[PDB]
């Protein structure tokens, strides 16, 4: 999902790359560096936003999103969720779920 012209929860709700990129994306397997036995939940991920980003936009707002019609007022509940879930990075995870 880290490449220009793509979509997905990361490409749309984390970090948008414009269709006219000039540059390089490079990553390496961090299984033995970032995973712990009990799960490394220090890396947080959003699934919900009001709208898609603009390229190179960074939103660190933690505002609780209103899934329903009633306002949340910063309090979770019915149809109210935090932006950030945690990722279960473990050394026994499969390649797809590895860091």
């Amino acid at each position, epitope marked *: 999902q880290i490449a220009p012209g793509q979509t997905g929860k990361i490409a749309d709700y984390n970090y948008k790359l414009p269709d006219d990129f000039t540059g390089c994306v490079i990553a390496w397997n961090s299984n033995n560096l970032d995973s712990k036995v009990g799960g490394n939940y220090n890396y947080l991920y959003r699934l919900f936003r009001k709208s898609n980003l603009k390229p190179f936009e960074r939103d*660190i707002s933690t505002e609780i999103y209103q899934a329903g019609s009633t306002p949340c007022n910063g309090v*979770e509940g019915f149809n109210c969720y935090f932006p950030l879930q945690s990722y279960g990075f473990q050394p026994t995870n499969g390649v797809g779920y590895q860091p």
Partner: nanobody
Amino acid sequence: QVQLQESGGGLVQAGGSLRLSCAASGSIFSPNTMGWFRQALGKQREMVAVISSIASTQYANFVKGRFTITRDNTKNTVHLQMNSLIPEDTAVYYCYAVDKSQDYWGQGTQVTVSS
């Protein structure tokens, strides 16, 4: 070296009250986010609460309506009011500066409640 000082825990009987504090020094650029996280021996970090620069307060469903965060703009510090305590709250807490760059965690505050 961004350093956050933790204080205000200890031993309290069921139903008591405490006031924890994280005071932040170092870089901590203006758009920061101060959170508090729970860990009991045998579990991982449980997210307790969060305040951003917007001053909005966010709390988990575990402790609904029982704990509060107070924000001090002058010293940019945070005080967590621990009220209506219950032995399910027996867990060391750590506070978390989201900031804009490298994140920094706490040294811990022992919170114990039992009878």
